Amino acid sequence: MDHLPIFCQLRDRDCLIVGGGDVAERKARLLLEAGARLTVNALTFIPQFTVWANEGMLTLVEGPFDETLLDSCWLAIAATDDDTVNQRVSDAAESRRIFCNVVDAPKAASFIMPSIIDRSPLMVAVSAGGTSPVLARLLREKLESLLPQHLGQVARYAGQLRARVKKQFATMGERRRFWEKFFVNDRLAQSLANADEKAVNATTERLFSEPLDHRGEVVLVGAGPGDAGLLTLKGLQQIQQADIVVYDRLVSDDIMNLVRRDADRVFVGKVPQEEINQILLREAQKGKRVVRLKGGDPFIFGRGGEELETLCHAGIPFSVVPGITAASGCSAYSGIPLTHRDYAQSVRLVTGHLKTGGELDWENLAAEKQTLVFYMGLNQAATIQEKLIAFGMQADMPVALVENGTSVKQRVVHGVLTQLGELAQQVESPALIIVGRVVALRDKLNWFSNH
Amino acid sequence: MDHLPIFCQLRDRDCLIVGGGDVAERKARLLLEAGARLTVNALTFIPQFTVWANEGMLTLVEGPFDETLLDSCWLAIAATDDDTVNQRVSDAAESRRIFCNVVDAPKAASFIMPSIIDRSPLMVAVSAGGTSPVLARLLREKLESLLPQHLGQVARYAGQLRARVKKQFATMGERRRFWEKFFVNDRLAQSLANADEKAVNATTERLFSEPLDHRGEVVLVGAGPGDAGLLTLKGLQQIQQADIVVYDRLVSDDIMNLVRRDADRVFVGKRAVPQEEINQILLREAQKGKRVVRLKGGDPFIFGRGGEELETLCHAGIPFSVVPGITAASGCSAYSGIPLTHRDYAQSVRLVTGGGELDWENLAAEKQTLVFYMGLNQAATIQEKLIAFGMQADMPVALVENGTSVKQRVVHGVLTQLGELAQQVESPALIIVGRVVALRDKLNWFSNH
Ligand SMILES: C[C@@]1(CC(=O)O)c2cc3[nH]c(cc4nc(cc5[nH]c(cc(n2)[C@H]1CCC(=O)O)[C@@](C)(CC(=O)O)[C@@H]5CCC(=O)O)C(CC(=O)O)=C4CCC(=O)O)c(CCC(=O)O)c3CC(=O)O
Ligand SMILES: Nc1ncnc2c1ncn2[C@@H]1O[C@H](CSCC[C@H](N)C(=O)O)[C@@H](O)[C@H]1O
Numbered sequence A: 001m002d003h004l005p006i007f008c009q010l011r012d013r014d015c016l017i018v019g020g021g022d023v024a025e026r027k028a029r030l031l032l033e034a035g036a037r038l039t040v041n042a043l044t045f046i047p048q049f050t051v052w053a054n055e056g057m058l059t060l061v062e063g064p065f066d067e068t069l070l071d072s073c074w075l076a077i078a079a080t081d082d083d084t085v086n087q088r089v090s091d092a093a094e095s096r097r098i099f100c101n102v103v104d105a106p107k108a109a110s111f112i113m114p115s116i117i118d119r120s121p122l123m124v125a126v127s128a129g130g131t132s133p134v135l136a137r138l139l140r141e142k143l144e145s146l147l148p149q150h151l152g153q154v155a156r157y158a159g160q161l162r163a164r165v166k167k168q169f170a171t172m173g174e175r176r177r178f179w180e181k182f183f184v185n186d187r188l189a190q191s192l193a194n195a196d197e198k199a200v201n202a203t204t205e206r207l208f209s210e211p212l213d214h215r216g217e218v219v220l221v222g223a224g225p226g227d228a229g230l231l232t233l234k235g236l237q238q239i240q241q242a243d244i245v246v247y248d249r250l251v252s253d254d255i256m257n258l259v260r261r262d263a264d265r266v267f268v269g270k271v272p273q274e275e276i277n278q279i280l281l282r283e284a285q286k287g288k289r290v291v292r293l294k295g296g297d298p299f300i301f302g303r304g305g306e307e308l309e310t311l312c313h314a315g316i317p318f319s320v321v322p323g324i325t326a327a328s329g330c331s332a333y334s335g336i337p338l339t340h341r342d343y344a345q346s347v348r349l350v351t352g353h354l355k356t357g358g359e360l361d362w363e364n365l366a367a368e369k370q371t372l373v374f375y376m377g378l379n380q381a382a383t384i385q386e387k388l389i390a391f392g393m394q395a396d397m398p399v400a401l402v403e404n405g406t407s408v409k410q411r412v413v414h415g416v417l418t419q420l421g422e423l424a425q426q427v428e429s430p431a432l433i434i435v436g437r438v439v440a441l442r443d444k445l446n447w448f449s450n451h
Numbered sequence B: 001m002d003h004l005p006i007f008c009q010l011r012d013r014d015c016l017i018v019g020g021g022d023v024a025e026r027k028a029r030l031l032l033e034a035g036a037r038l039t040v041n042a043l044t045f046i047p048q049f050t051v052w053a054n055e056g057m058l059t060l061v062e063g064p065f066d067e068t069l070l071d072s073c074w075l076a077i078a079a080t081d082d083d084t085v086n087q088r089v090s091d092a093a094e095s096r097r098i099f100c101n102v103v104d105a106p107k108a109a110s111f112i113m114p115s116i117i118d119r120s121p122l123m124v125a126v127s128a129g130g131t132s133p134v135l136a137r138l139l140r141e142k143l144e145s146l147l148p149q150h151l152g153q154v155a156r157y158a159g160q161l162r163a164r165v166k167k168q169f170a171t172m173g174e175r176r177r178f179w180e181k182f183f184v185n186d187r188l189a190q191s192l193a194n195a196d197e198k199a200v201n202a203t204t205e206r207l208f209s210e211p212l213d214h215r216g217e218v219v220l221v222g223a224g225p226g227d228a229g230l231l232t233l234k235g236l237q238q239i240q241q242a243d244i245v246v247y248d249r250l251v252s253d254d255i256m257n258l259v260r261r262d263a264d265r266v267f268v269g270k271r272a273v274p275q276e277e278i279n280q281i282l283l284r285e286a287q288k289g290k291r292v293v294r295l296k297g298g299d300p301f302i303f304g305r306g307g308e309e310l311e312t313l314c315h316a317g318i319p320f321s322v323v324p325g326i327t328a329a330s331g332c333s334a335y336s337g338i339p340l341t342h343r344d345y346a347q348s349v350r351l352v353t354g355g356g357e358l359d360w361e362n363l364a365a366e367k368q369t370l371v372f373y374m375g376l377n378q379a380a381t382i383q384e385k386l387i388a389f390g391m392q393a394d395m396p397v398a399l400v401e402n403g404t405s406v407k408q409r410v411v412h413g414v415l416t417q418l419g420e421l422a423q424q425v426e427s428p429a430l431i432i433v434g435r436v437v438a439l440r441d442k443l444n445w446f447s448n449h
């Protein structure tokens, strides 16, 4: 984070503006609306300032900068056209540990003032750190269109109900569930906007009267292969409302940042699968809303079935949000479609890491007109090469390995089947092996990166 | 207003957190991300704090709150479970004019913490003034889905490019039109994030070379199998920026409802259309300078002919990209309670299409999950051939019609019933064959129709 956004309570707190022109006037108006106890220190003032001072709304100090005016201050704003003066102000503020904005130099000093979308008491602040005023304006335009004008009345009414919600629901889990219903009842929002107090009260009474599900919940969510843009809308929804998220190392850091910030997080793996099952079950038996966040898709070599197979008998509600499997993401981001024209009748998603005595069906895998995708197969790439050749696959069949597919770190190496063992030495886990004529299309379809 | 939002520069500035449990750890994570020179003071610390301390990321002071720890501090956060301690911290900070937050307390705080959407240098913060923390979270979720992951990359790159923008643009009206195209170029942002200097330089020169009104590109977007919640975040972001959306019947109405109202729409599906005509539409519209989204059911590269649509473009000089989607196999699997793999049931999953002809001995072999796309008409033949090439007659089979939608229909039985079960469903439907079908009785959670 370049900056930390905070929302300050300035009511009755001393603040100082140095400067007295149009810039100072805009900042002073903002600080006055926030209730600051404002002093303005400038050599000259535009007329808006003199009337403010006579009607008692702020104090004017007409003259050069007096750094002792910072002594009682919580915030300072340097708003002159003299960079020498502005720097004296910022230096004096920094020595007193007073957050200071230099209006014409956002990279100097110690805070910047964001653009504000006002749905009071709801506020949304936007800034690009001065690097890009256009982008901030384009975002502000877009945010103003997304936020209904009546949102403020919903937030206002919620604040008025917080005491009643605290009294009537004994646990935070119940309170949270009430609010999640409250904030999406469109009728309630309309009635507030119409000041229809009878209608507001009717829907409110009913919301308070509803029995709340105290049962837990286990949702398996497919994180996808790494690019946080490949999480589904519903997957984002589920992790944003989870009490606890049980996640593995194949879930990318970018995706974990999208988890509800107050959710508890439990890491598994690098842990035996039976202990994962117990965690999910036990945490849901406590009434908690559990998300098992899994790399790729939960039902393709993810053991997702094992994690749910006890829950029905145990009376635990569950659901599954599918994800982009490694095969799909790596295909798209390497320029290798899994199917194309008559290249492949079928796609085979194969595990390269099989049970101790198990052996893959090589005669079956080596058949023509298919795209083979090996998961967890790096260690066996030499055997895969030898077996596919022995069961009739052409030696010049193209192969590709995709390492960290869809991430900014993705790497792709490629060649023909007789190089598979050598090529696999050039990558590490997590990596996918693609075998089939579609690999040759990468020269025409690669769009994501050359690395 | 009742609170003034400011964006604080905390890099190497002394900040104090009082508390050492889960609540304090969340605040410490936030202040560390902002670069704060952080001290944490608590009667005891959970293990995350000692880990951080050993890696030199912060300083720990084990013991009761000592208000002299505030003497050089710019921000304070009271994050204990003891109201008396938190009030001592808040009073000590206020007497020093140090903005102070008390977590899970509205007043006695001189600042409150908003929900944060980080695209640094770009940042968005949402606050309801203490009235509605859940509303702030819900708005964060909405904004996180809408702001592309790498927007901060272009925001930073804008700097080293303003000398060139004004040497080529003298009017104020044109400069904004350039930036408007620049900041929505998600390809450039990803290439910057990829550290792909070759791609960055190529995309940059095109931004200056082409006319202002030209924004030609094609994005293949996987709509998923129907449920609008199964669109990816990037898929949503792309359809929100499209000049024109080209779609067909297997893109659900729910997904099309997310299409930016205003976008020109071209329907290429079944009514009462050769692929070449579709390829040319994408080509022609891209060359007219339009940002074109080709929305496809499921995933574009799994029986979607997405490759055919793109090879038209690579040698026409038209930039393109692909957003994968949830394929029908994955969506139907999740929503029917039939995992495609499970324990040792299946060593492989086969996604298969219903000149040429299928290899039946291959398809009949054990330890597979078969998923037939577009096979509804051949379902009687699939039954006969799988039986005749040795698949067990008692093998479970299922058909999923309109998978993931509110009208999803799942019928199931055994291989000898496949032809008759297929009469009970309509396209689009998936046929699933394999031992995993038997898990539906334990795992079906979605309503059947
Ligand atoms: C005043 C404020 C404190 C301050 O910062 O000064 C406040 C106060 C309280 N929160 C409480 C509980 C919850 N807090 C959250 C979530 C968030 N709380 C946040 C900030 C704020 N919380 C401040 C201003 C809020 C505003 O602007 O409207 C967020 C946005 C920012 C952050 O903290 O990081 C963060 C989401 C971050 C993200 O996910 O993006 C949830 C929901 C959830 O967990 O999903 C719940 C449960 C549901 C509910 O109770 O509503 C309680 C009752 C405790 C109890 O029951 O005893 C109080 C006390 C009270 O005021 O009643
Ligand atoms: N980003 C990535 N790039 C390449 N391969 C990946 C990958 N993420 C997962 N994999 C593959 O997936 C294997 C783990 S098995 C779990 C796969 C996951 N359920 C899915 O649907 O994709 C790894 O060994 C690797 O072969």
Ligand SMILES: Nc1ncnc2c1ncn2[C@@H]1O[C@H](CSCC[C@H](N)C(=O)O)[C@@H](O)[C@H]1O
Binding pocket: B225, B226, B250, B296, B297, B298, B299, B300, B301, B302, B303, B304, B326, B327, B328, B329, B332, B372, B373, B374, B375, B400, B401, B402, B403, B404, B405, B427, B428, B429, B430
């Ligand atoms: N919602 C759905 N439910 C069941 N099958 C579906 C489906 N959507 C698409 N299909 C299957 O896909 C076939 C069209 S081929 C298109 C496949 C798409 N690219 C994907 O990845 O899913 C249909 O005949 C049907 O078998």
Ligand SMILES: [Cl-]
Binding pocket: A300, A301, A302, A303, A304, B341, B342, B343
């Ligand atoms: Cl599995």
Ligand SMILES: [Cl-]
Binding pocket: A367, A368, A392, A393, A394, A397
């Ligand atoms: Cl071959």
